[PDB]
PDB file of C-alpha atoms in Angstrom:
ATOM      1  CA  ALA A   1      -5.201   6.986  14.410  1.00 55.40           C
ATOM      2  CA  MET A   2      -7.354   8.836  11.812  1.00 54.40           C
ATOM      3  CA  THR A   3      -7.231   6.275   9.001  1.00 57.62           C
ATOM      4  CA  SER A   4      -9.331   3.392  10.400  1.00 59.38           C
ATOM      5  CA  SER A   5     -12.815   1.997   9.593  1.00 59.77           C
ATOM      6  CA  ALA A   6     -13.935   3.504  12.936  1.00 61.70           C
ATOM      7  CA  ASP A   7     -12.766   6.964  11.909  1.00 64.63           C
ATOM      8  CA  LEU A   8     -14.802   6.529   8.645  1.00 63.28           C
ATOM      9  CA  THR A   9     -17.857   5.314  10.605  1.00 62.05           C
ATOM     10  CA  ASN A  10     -17.775   8.388  12.906  1.00 64.38           C
ATOM     11  CA  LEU A  11     -17.415  10.906  10.033  1.00 60.02           C
ATOM     12  CA  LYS A  12     -20.339   9.310   8.221  1.00 57.27           C
ATOM     13  CA  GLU A  13     -22.505   9.586  11.287  1.00 55.70           C
ATOM     14  CA  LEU A  14     -21.373  13.276  11.697  1.00 54.38           C
ATOM     15  CA  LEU A  15     -22.285  13.802   8.029  1.00 52.28           C
ATOM     16  CA  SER A  16     -25.701  12.219   8.310  1.00 52.23           C
ATOM     17  CA  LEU A  17     -26.476  14.268  11.411  1.00 51.90           C
ATOM     18  CA  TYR A  18     -25.330  17.480   9.731  1.00 54.29           C
ATOM     19  CA  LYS A  19     -27.739  16.915   6.865  1.00 53.80           C
ATOM     20  CA  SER A  20     -31.022  16.603   8.894  1.00 54.59           C
ATOM     21  CA  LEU A  21     -29.989  18.960  11.723  1.00 49.50           C
ATOM     22  CA  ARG A  22     -33.346  18.388  13.507  1.00 47.36           C
ATOM     23  CA  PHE A  23     -32.377  17.089  16.908  1.00 48.05           C
ATOM     24  CA  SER A  24     -35.141  15.543  18.925  1.00 45.86           C
ATOM     25  CA  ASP A  25     -33.279  15.430  22.250  1.00 46.50           C
ATOM     26  CA  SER A  26     -30.237  16.705  24.097  1.00 48.05           C
ATOM     27  CA  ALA A  27     -28.120  13.551  23.502  1.00 46.67           C
ATOM     28  CA  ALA A  28     -28.559  13.724  19.695  1.00 48.28           C
ATOM     29  CA  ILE A  29     -27.276  17.321  19.783  1.00 46.88           C
ATOM     30  CA  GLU A  30     -24.509  16.327  22.183  1.00 44.66           C
ATOM     31  CA  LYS A  31     -23.529  13.436  19.898  1.00 45.36           C
ATOM     32  CA  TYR A  32     -23.188  15.909  17.043  1.00 49.25           C
ATOM     33  CA  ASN A  33     -21.096  18.449  18.973  1.00 50.97           C
ATOM     34  CA  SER A  34     -18.987  15.595  20.356  1.00 45.26           C
ATOM     35  CA  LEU A  35     -18.326  14.310  16.837  1.00 45.32           C
ATOM     36  CA  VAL A  36     -17.574  17.790  15.590  1.00 46.64           C
ATOM     37  CA  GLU A  37     -15.097  18.286  18.409  1.00 47.49           C
ATOM     38  CA  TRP A  38     -13.526  14.849  17.773  1.00 47.30           C
ATOM     39  CA  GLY A  39     -13.256  15.552  13.965  1.00 46.42           C
ATOM     40  CA  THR A  40     -11.736  18.960  14.612  1.00 47.23           C
ATOM     41  CA  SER A  41      -9.134  17.584  16.998  1.00 49.74           C
ATOM     42  CA  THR A  42      -8.259  14.485  14.859  1.00 50.00           C
ATOM     43  CA  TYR A  43      -8.092  16.325  11.427  1.00 46.40           C
ATOM     44  CA  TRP A  44      -7.198  19.879  12.653  1.00 47.47           C
ATOM     45  CA  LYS A  45     -10.099  21.487  10.872  1.00 47.14           C
ATOM     46  CA  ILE A  46     -13.298  20.242   9.283  1.00 48.19           C
ATOM     47  CA  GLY A  47     -16.125  22.112   7.494  1.00 46.32           C
ATOM     48  CA  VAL A  48     -18.849  22.011  10.149  1.00 45.86           C
ATOM     49  CA  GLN A  49     -19.209  23.852  13.415  1.00 44.61           C
ATOM     50  CA  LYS A  50     -20.837  23.050  16.686  1.00 44.56           C
ATOM     51  CA  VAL A  51     -24.484  24.079  17.050  1.00 44.44           C
TER      52      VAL A  51
ATOM     53  CA  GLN B   1      -3.309  35.055 -23.015  1.00 42.22           C
ATOM     54  CA  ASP B   2      -1.362  31.991 -21.654  1.00 40.42           C
ATOM     55  CA  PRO B   3      -1.674  30.681 -18.030  1.00 42.01           C
ATOM     56  CA  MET B   4       2.103  29.700 -18.119  1.00 41.44           C
ATOM     57  CA  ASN B   5       4.779  32.138 -16.936  1.00 40.40           C
ATOM     58  CA  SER B   6       8.511  31.543 -16.540  1.00 38.05           C
ATOM     59  CA  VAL B   7      11.181  32.969 -14.260  1.00 39.38           C
ATOM     60  CA  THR B   8      14.939  32.542 -14.384  1.00 39.92           C
ATOM     61  CA  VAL B   9      17.288  31.188 -11.668  1.00 41.04           C
ATOM     62  CA  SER B  10      21.079  30.986 -11.618  1.00 41.14           C
ATOM     63  CA  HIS B  11      21.451  27.209 -11.439  1.00 43.37           C
ATOM     64  CA  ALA B  12      20.019  24.336 -13.337  1.00 45.42           C
ATOM     65  CA  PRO B  13      17.290  24.093 -14.430  1.00 46.04           C
ATOM     66  CA  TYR B  14      17.743  27.892 -15.008  1.00 46.05           C
ATOM     67  CA  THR B  15      14.121  28.422 -16.061  1.00 45.61           C
ATOM     68  CA  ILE B  16      11.119  27.483 -13.889  1.00 43.33           C
ATOM     69  CA  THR B  17       7.858  27.449 -15.783  1.00 43.70           C
ATOM     70  CA  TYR B  18       4.566  27.854 -13.810  1.00 48.49           C
ATOM     71  CA  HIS B  19       0.789  28.277 -13.833  1.00 44.62           C
ATOM     72  CA  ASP B  20      -0.560  31.693 -12.685  1.00 45.35           C
ATOM     73  CA  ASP B  21      -1.952  30.222  -9.455  1.00 47.18           C
ATOM     74  CA  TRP B  22       1.702  29.849  -8.273  1.00 49.65           C
ATOM     75  CA  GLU B  23       2.663  33.572  -8.779  1.00 50.09           C
ATOM     76  CA  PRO B  24       2.537  34.688  -5.213  1.00 50.87           C
ATOM     77  CA  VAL B  25       5.346  32.243  -4.196  1.00 51.29           C
ATOM     78  CA  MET B  26       7.815  32.791  -7.060  1.00 53.00           C
ATOM     79  CA  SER B  27       9.819  35.737  -5.969  1.00 51.89           C
ATOM     80  CA  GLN B  28      10.770  33.617  -2.848  1.00 50.05           C
ATOM     81  CA  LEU B  29      11.118  30.229  -4.609  1.00 47.68           C
ATOM     82  CA  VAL B  30      13.695  31.916  -6.910  1.00 47.35           C
ATOM     83  CA  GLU B  31      15.438  33.597  -4.038  1.00 49.76           C
ATOM     84  CA  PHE B  32      15.614  30.361  -1.915  1.00 49.05           C
ATOM     85  CA  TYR B  33      16.449  28.010  -4.729  1.00 47.35           C
ATOM     86  CA  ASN B  34      19.464  30.215  -5.757  1.00 45.91           C
ATOM     87  CA  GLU B  35      21.165  29.928  -2.431  1.00 45.68           C
ATOM     88  CA  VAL B  36      20.855  26.081  -2.363  1.00 44.28           C
ATOM     89  CA  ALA B  37      20.810  24.786  -5.879  1.00 45.09           C
ATOM     90  CA  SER B  38      24.652  24.706  -5.903  1.00 43.10           C
ATOM     91  CA  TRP B  39      24.965  22.213  -3.021  1.00 42.95           C
ATOM     92  CA  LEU B  40      22.012  20.186  -4.311  1.00 44.37           C
ATOM     93  CA  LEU B  41      23.316  19.811  -7.884  1.00 42.70           C
ATOM     94  CA  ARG B  42      26.564  18.213  -6.487  1.00 40.12           C
ATOM     95  CA  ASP B  43      24.806  14.782  -6.265  1.00 42.18           C
ATOM     96  CA  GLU B  44      22.840  13.024  -9.001  1.00 44.74           C
ATOM     97  CA  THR B  45      19.054  13.438  -8.430  1.00 44.99           C
ATOM     98  CA  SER B  46      15.711  11.766  -8.679  1.00 43.93           C
ATOM     99  CA  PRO B  47      14.159  13.329 -10.591  1.00 46.47           C
ATOM    100  CA  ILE B  48      16.608  15.171 -12.925  1.00 50.05           C
ATOM    101  CA  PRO B  49      16.990  18.933 -12.336  1.00 54.15           C
ATOM    102  CA  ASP B  50      14.898  19.738 -15.454  1.00 58.61           C
ATOM    103  CA  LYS B  51      11.945  17.865 -13.891  1.00 58.13           C
ATOM    104  CA  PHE B  52      12.216  19.278 -10.291  1.00 58.82           C
ATOM    105  CA  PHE B  53       9.460  21.842 -10.816  1.00 55.30           C
ATOM    106  CA  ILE B  54       7.172  20.489 -13.569  1.00 58.41           C
ATOM    107  CA  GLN B  55       4.310  20.186 -11.077  1.00 58.49           C
ATOM    108  CA  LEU B  56       4.347  24.012 -10.817  1.00 55.96           C
ATOM    109  CA  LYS B  57       2.531  23.870 -14.185  1.00 56.44           C
ATOM    110  CA  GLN B  58      -0.557  22.453 -12.465  1.00 54.15           C
ATOM    111  CA  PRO B  59      -3.420  24.892 -11.616  1.00 51.83           C
ATOM    112  CA  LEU B  60      -4.442  25.122  -7.903  1.00 53.61           C
ATOM    113  CA  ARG B  61      -7.910  26.904  -8.036  1.00 53.56           C
ATOM    114  CA  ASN B  62      -9.693  23.692  -9.133  1.00 53.24           C
ATOM    115  CA  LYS B  63      -7.910  21.530  -6.475  1.00 50.40           C
ATOM    116  CA  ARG B  64      -9.865  20.031  -3.514  1.00 51.21           C
ATOM    117  CA  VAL B  65      -7.211  17.399  -2.384  1.00 50.83           C
ATOM    118  CA  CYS B  66      -3.420  17.295  -2.075  1.00 50.90           C
ATOM    119  CA  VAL B  67      -2.047  13.767  -1.859  1.00 51.66           C
ATOM    120  CA  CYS B  68       1.446  14.259  -0.431  1.00 50.87           C
ATOM    121  CA  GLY B  69       4.507  11.946  -0.228  1.00 52.79           C
ATOM    122  CA  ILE B  70       7.662  12.906   1.598  1.00 52.20           C
ATOM    123  CA  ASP B  71       9.964  13.018  -1.485  1.00 47.12           C
ATOM    124  CA  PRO B  72      10.292  11.533  -5.024  1.00 46.09           C
ATOM    125  CA  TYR B  73      10.946   7.936  -5.837  1.00 48.16           C
ATOM    126  CA  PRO B  74      14.636   7.334  -5.018  1.00 48.05           C
ATOM    127  CA  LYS B  75      14.866   6.293  -8.655  1.00 49.74           C
ATOM    128  CA  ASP B  76      12.949   7.096 -11.884  1.00 50.93           C
ATOM    129  CA  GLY B  77      11.193  10.197 -10.490  1.00 51.34           C
ATOM    130  CA  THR B  78       9.508  12.016 -13.372  1.00 51.10           C
ATOM    131  CA  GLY B  79       8.886  15.196 -11.347  1.00 53.07           C
ATOM    132  CA  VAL B  80       5.194  14.124 -11.184  1.00 52.45           C
ATOM    133  CA  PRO B  81       4.671  12.871  -7.686  1.00 51.10           C
ATOM    134  CA  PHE B  82       3.730   9.185  -7.446  1.00 51.30           C
ATOM    135  CA  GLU B  83       3.840   8.793 -11.198  1.00 51.67           C
ATOM    136  CA  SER B  84       5.381   5.559 -12.579  1.00 50.63           C
ATOM    137  CA  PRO B  85       4.541   5.670 -16.337  1.00 50.13           C
ATOM    138  CA  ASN B  86       5.322   1.937 -16.854  1.00 50.11           C
ATOM    139  CA  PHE B  87       3.307   1.093 -13.676  1.00 53.15           C
ATOM    140  CA  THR B  88       6.400  -0.340 -11.937  1.00 50.63           C
ATOM    141  CA  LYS B  89       6.682   1.364  -8.506  1.00 49.77           C
ATOM    142  CA  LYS B  90       5.319  -0.361  -5.406  1.00 49.82           C
ATOM    143  CA  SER B  91       3.659   2.709  -3.905  1.00 47.42           C
ATOM    144  CA  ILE B  92       1.583   3.502  -6.933  1.00 50.34           C
ATOM    145  CA  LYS B  93       0.675  -0.203  -7.433  1.00 48.44           C
ATOM    146  CA  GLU B  94      -0.453  -0.484  -3.847  1.00 50.88           C
ATOM    147  CA  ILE B  95      -2.493   2.678  -4.238  1.00 52.86           C
ATOM    148  CA  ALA B  96      -4.028   1.245  -7.424  1.00 52.76           C
ATOM    149  CA  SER B  97      -5.061  -1.845  -5.359  1.00 54.69           C
ATOM    150  CA  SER B  98      -6.822   0.256  -2.597  1.00 53.78           C
ATOM    151  CA  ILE B  99      -8.895   1.941  -5.353  1.00 57.42           C
ATOM    152  CA  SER B 100      -9.630  -1.270  -7.247  1.00 55.78           C
ATOM    153  CA  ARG B 101     -11.123  -2.531  -3.964  1.00 54.73           C
ATOM    154  CA  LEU B 102     -13.014   0.698  -3.280  1.00 55.12           C
ATOM    155  CA  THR B 103     -14.509   1.224  -6.824  1.00 56.01           C
ATOM    156  CA  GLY B 104     -14.660  -2.415  -8.026  1.00 57.37           C
ATOM    157  CA  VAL B 105     -12.672  -1.625 -11.201  1.00 61.62           C
ATOM    158  CA  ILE B 106     -10.769  -4.932 -11.489  1.00 62.82           C
ATOM    159  CA  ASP B 107      -9.110  -4.719 -14.966  1.00 65.23           C
ATOM    160  CA  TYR B 108      -6.596  -1.877 -15.436  1.00 63.04           C
ATOM    161  CA  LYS B 109      -3.093  -1.256 -16.903  1.00 59.86           C
ATOM    162  CA  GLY B 110      -1.916   1.849 -14.959  1.00 62.38           C
ATOM    163  CA  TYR B 111      -2.851   4.436 -12.323  1.00 63.77           C
ATOM    164  CA  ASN B 112      -1.824   8.111 -12.001  1.00 64.77           C
ATOM    165  CA  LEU B 113      -2.956  10.558  -9.264  1.00 66.49           C
ATOM    166  CA  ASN B 114      -2.090  13.486 -11.597  1.00 66.01           C
ATOM    167  CA  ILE B 115      -5.015  12.931 -13.973  1.00 66.12           C
ATOM    168  CA  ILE B 116      -7.694  12.925 -11.269  1.00 65.23           C
ATOM    169  CA  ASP B 117     -10.000  15.920 -11.298  1.00 65.52           C
ATOM    170  CA  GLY B 118      -9.639  17.786  -8.009  1.00 66.65           C
ATOM    171  CA  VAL B 119      -6.425  16.070  -6.916  1.00 66.16           C
ATOM    172  CA  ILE B 120      -2.862  17.388  -6.903  1.00 64.35           C
ATOM    173  CA  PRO B 121      -0.112  14.886  -6.051  1.00 64.88           C
ATOM    174  CA  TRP B 122       2.793  16.409  -4.259  1.00 65.87           C
ATOM    175  CA  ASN B 123       6.292  15.693  -2.889  1.00 63.31           C
ATOM    176  CA  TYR B 124       7.217  17.600   0.156  1.00 61.01           C
ATOM    177  CA  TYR B 125      10.899  17.559  -0.904  1.00 58.83           C
ATOM    178  CA  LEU B 126      11.424  18.173  -4.593  1.00 64.17           C
ATOM    179  CA  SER B 127      14.498  15.879  -5.006  1.00 65.38           C
ATOM    180  CA  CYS B 128      16.716  13.275  -3.447  1.00 65.51           C
ATOM    181  CA  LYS B 129      20.173  11.901  -4.180  1.00 62.63           C
ATOM    182  CA  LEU B 130      19.771   8.858  -6.407  1.00 65.03           C
ATOM    183  CA  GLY B 131      18.939   5.788  -4.312  1.00 65.88           C
ATOM    184  CA  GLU B 132      18.723   7.625  -0.966  1.00 66.29           C
ATOM    185  CA  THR B 133      15.386   8.693   0.545  1.00 66.70           C
ATOM    186  CA  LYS B 134      15.333  12.045   2.371  1.00 67.24           C
ATOM    187  CA  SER B 135      18.911  13.000   1.382  1.00 67.20           C
ATOM    188  CA  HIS B 136      17.973  16.541   0.181  1.00 67.32           C
ATOM    189  CA  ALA B 137      15.674  17.433   3.075  1.00 68.43           C
ATOM    190  CA  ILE B 138      18.067  19.882   4.582  1.00 67.38           C
ATOM    191  CA  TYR B 139      18.235  21.789   1.250  1.00 66.73           C
ATOM    192  CA  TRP B 140      14.552  21.846   0.430  1.00 65.43           C
ATOM    193  CA  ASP B 141      13.341  22.856   3.938  1.00 59.84           C
ATOM    194  CA  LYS B 142      12.368  26.562   3.492  1.00 57.54           C
ATOM    195  CA  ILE B 143      11.006  25.929  -0.058  1.00 56.94           C
ATOM    196  CA  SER B 144       9.028  22.900   0.921  1.00 56.86           C
ATOM    197  CA  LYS B 145       7.148  24.835   3.595  1.00 54.72           C
ATOM    198  CA  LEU B 146       6.536  27.786   1.324  1.00 54.32           C
ATOM    199  CA  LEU B 147       5.089  25.617  -1.388  1.00 52.91           C
ATOM    200  CA  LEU B 148       2.959  23.337   0.773  1.00 54.39           C
ATOM    201  CA  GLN B 149       1.582  26.468   2.574  1.00 55.41           C
ATOM    202  CA  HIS B 150       0.405  27.709  -0.812  1.00 56.13           C
ATOM    203  CA  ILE B 151      -1.199  24.570  -1.830  1.00 57.30           C
ATOM    204  CA  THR B 152      -3.177  24.269   1.463  1.00 54.69           C
ATOM    205  CA  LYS B 153      -4.748  27.683   0.834  1.00 54.63           C
ATOM    206  CA  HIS B 154      -6.506  26.033  -2.037  1.00 53.94           C
ATOM    207  CA  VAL B 155      -7.247  22.559  -0.997  1.00 50.87           C
ATOM    208  CA  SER B 156      -9.937  21.485   1.403  1.00 47.89           C
ATOM    209  CA  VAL B 157      -8.047  18.231   2.365  1.00 49.21           C
ATOM    210  CA  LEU B 158      -4.315  17.589   2.694  1.00 50.64           C
ATOM    211  CA  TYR B 159      -3.571  13.785   2.753  1.00 51.29           C
ATOM    212  CA  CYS B 160       0.004  12.838   3.777  1.00 48.40           C
ATOM    213  CA  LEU B 161       1.343   9.275   3.406  1.00 50.38           C
ATOM    214  CA  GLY B 162       4.011   8.515   5.992  1.00 51.93           C
ATOM    215  CA  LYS B 163       3.091   8.422   9.724  1.00 55.48           C
ATOM    216  CA  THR B 164       6.732   8.838  10.761  1.00 55.91           C
ATOM    217  CA  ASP B 165       7.657  11.115   7.820  1.00 58.67           C
ATOM    218  CA  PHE B 166       4.646  13.429   8.539  1.00 56.77           C
ATOM    219  CA  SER B 167       4.171  13.233  12.307  1.00 55.10           C
ATOM    220  CA  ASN B 168       5.167  16.884  12.669  1.00 52.55           C
ATOM    221  CA  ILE B 169       3.283  18.330   9.630  1.00 49.79           C
ATOM    222  CA  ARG B 170       1.058  20.833  11.505  1.00 48.09           C
ATOM    223  CA  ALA B 171       4.224  22.642  12.709  1.00 48.99           C
ATOM    224  CA  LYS B 172       5.090  23.203   9.044  1.00 48.18           C
ATOM    225  CA  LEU B 173       1.868  25.126   8.215  1.00 47.96           C
ATOM    226  CA  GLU B 174       0.577  28.524   9.237  1.00 49.70           C
ATOM    227  CA  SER B 175      -3.181  28.299   9.125  1.00 51.93           C
ATOM    228  CA  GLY B 176      -5.203  25.125   9.715  1.00 53.71           C
ATOM    229  CA  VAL B 177      -6.310  22.719   7.009  1.00 56.72           C
ATOM    230  CA  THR B 178      -8.149  19.425   7.084  1.00 56.74           C
ATOM    231  CA  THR B 179      -5.073  17.142   7.532  1.00 53.77           C
ATOM    232  CA  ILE B 180      -5.067  13.334   7.434  1.00 53.30           C
ATOM    233  CA  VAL B 181      -1.764  11.424   7.983  1.00 53.98           C
ATOM    234  CA  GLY B 182      -1.924   7.861   6.637  1.00 54.81           C
ATOM    235  CA  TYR B 183       0.404   4.885   6.393  1.00 52.41           C
ATOM    236  CA  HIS B 184       3.094   4.693   3.695  1.00 52.17           C
ATOM    237  CA  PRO B 185       1.977   2.018   1.088  1.00 53.64           C
ATOM    238  CA  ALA B 186       5.138   0.037   2.015  1.00 55.26           C
ATOM    239  CA  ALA B 187       4.353   0.240   5.797  1.00 53.65           C
ATOM    240  CA  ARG B 188       4.858  -3.029   7.728  1.00 55.65           C
ATOM    241  CA  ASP B 189       2.016  -5.495   8.439  1.00 58.21           C
ATOM    242  CA  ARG B 190      -0.016  -4.627   5.285  1.00 59.05           C
ATOM    243  CA  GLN B 191      -1.304  -1.592   7.346  1.00 57.15           C
ATOM    244  CA  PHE B 192      -1.946   0.467   4.212  1.00 57.22           C
ATOM    245  CA  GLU B 193      -4.267  -2.268   2.977  1.00 59.77           C
ATOM    246  CA  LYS B 194      -6.721  -1.595   5.890  1.00 63.76           C
ATOM    247  CA  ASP B 195      -6.107   2.219   5.714  1.00 68.83           C
ATOM    248  CA  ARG B 196      -9.332   3.863   4.441  1.00 64.26           C
ATOM    249  CA  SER B 197      -8.018   7.324   3.754  1.00 64.20           C
ATOM    250  CA  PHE B 198      -9.458   7.538   0.285  1.00 66.40           C
ATOM    251  CA  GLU B 199     -12.959   7.071   1.612  1.00 64.53           C
ATOM    252  CA  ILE B 200     -12.307   9.365   4.666  1.00 68.34           C
ATOM    253  CA  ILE B 201     -11.262  12.258   2.383  1.00 66.57           C
ATOM    254  CA  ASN B 202     -14.491  12.102   0.460  1.00 67.71           C
ATOM    255  CA  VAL B 203     -16.626  12.267   3.580  1.00 71.42           C
ATOM    256  CA  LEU B 204     -14.546  15.094   4.845  1.00 73.77           C
ATOM    257  CA  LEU B 205     -15.106  16.891   1.489  1.00 74.70           C
ATOM    258  CA  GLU B 206     -18.885  16.471   1.740  1.00 74.61           C
ATOM    259  CA  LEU B 207     -18.691  18.075   5.168  1.00 77.76           C
ATOM    260  CA  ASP B 208     -16.911  21.181   3.676  1.00 77.30           C
ATOM    261  CA  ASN B 209     -19.615  21.245   0.967  1.00 74.39           C
ATOM    262  CA  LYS B 210     -17.162  20.113  -1.657  1.00 77.31           C
ATOM    263  CA  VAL B 211     -17.574  17.430  -4.248  1.00 77.71           C
ATOM    264  CA  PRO B 212     -15.975  14.119  -3.658  1.00 80.78           C
ATOM    265  CA  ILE B 213     -13.004  12.765  -5.595  1.00 82.20           C
ATOM    266  CA  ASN B 214     -13.635  10.277  -8.331  1.00 85.29           C
ATOM    267  CA  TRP B 215     -10.729   7.896  -7.548  1.00 85.00           C
ATOM    268  CA  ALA B 216     -11.494   5.754 -10.634  1.00 84.11           C
ATOM    269  CA  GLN B 217     -10.431   8.582 -13.050  1.00 81.77           C
ATOM    270  CA  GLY B 218      -6.817   7.724 -12.074  1.00 85.20           C
ATOM    271  CA  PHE B 219      -7.026   4.386 -13.823  1.00 86.57           C
ATOM    272  CA  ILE B 220      -5.163   3.751 -17.097  1.00 90.08           C
ATOM    273  CA  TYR B 221      -6.800   1.164 -19.320  1.00 88.15           C
TER     274      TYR B 221
END
């Protein structure tokens, strides 16, 4: 889909997480790596890696 | 001394003038264009032959985004992708609307993607037969790949408008690039109106530690 408000919401969350990068629990970190993997698959390549 | 070079081909426009950033593709552009220019020059073109390659004068090294359409306007192509200097064409007017909404700039006279710092507008196919979209696809094929490959070495984000036109774009590229495929501005159902690609690109840029695009710089007052 890639072009939707939902797509923009998820990339913003991914961006906000990437900035602090202090995960308090194993579902925060999993959210981040799940976003990264979603971003990577939807846009082919993005500028952040899994941690 | 000068960033502009020039090489000579054996069909109109005879001379292709370019910025240094394009050097590594020229030997092949020349070679490929010489075997097809003959067939292609049989029909009348948008844009005219003398305008086919004017966007090779644009530097690449400062470019973060490539905003790509499938081919020029079927009429009045200036060789500057998306450009309508009288602010006539539907695609550019629709795009001007999306960015009025985004930035809140409500009073404007024109809009051109080619004056926006960081952005390079692009046409995958460099011509068409007057009035007929995608007519020269079969001629441009090898060139179009070559050139878009080069551009995507420089840009962080490639943004293609045309879900059907660009559904197979990844096949056309060697190495990966951030690629977003949006709706054509004349898609059915006003779908381009709720398409948020301009905002998505900026977030994606921030994630590749690049600076976002100032979409308002495209306005003509």
